[PDB]
């Protein structure tokens, strides 16, 4: 699997104090994929665990 898969996005997690639970989320925009969650194996999209 390509090493750029799940890393072309630029996401960092929102800090503590909001109802979301510490996941690296998409930064802003009037888009469906905005504050959703990336850079994890549990999220839709994102990186797979231990990429081959």
């Amino acid at each position: 699997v390509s090493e750029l898969a799940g890393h072309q996005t630029s996401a960092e997690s929102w800090g503590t104090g909001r109802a979301v639970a510490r996941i690296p989320r998409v930064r802003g925009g009037g888009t469906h994929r905005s504050g959703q969650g990336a850079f994890g194996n549990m999220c839709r999209g994102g990186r797979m665990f231990a990429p081959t």
Partner: peptide
Amino acid sequence: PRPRPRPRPRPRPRPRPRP
């Protein structure tokens, strides 16, 4: 299209005591 996020925005801070 679906809106931008704006949750409950950080409730009212209190005074901080000493010792």
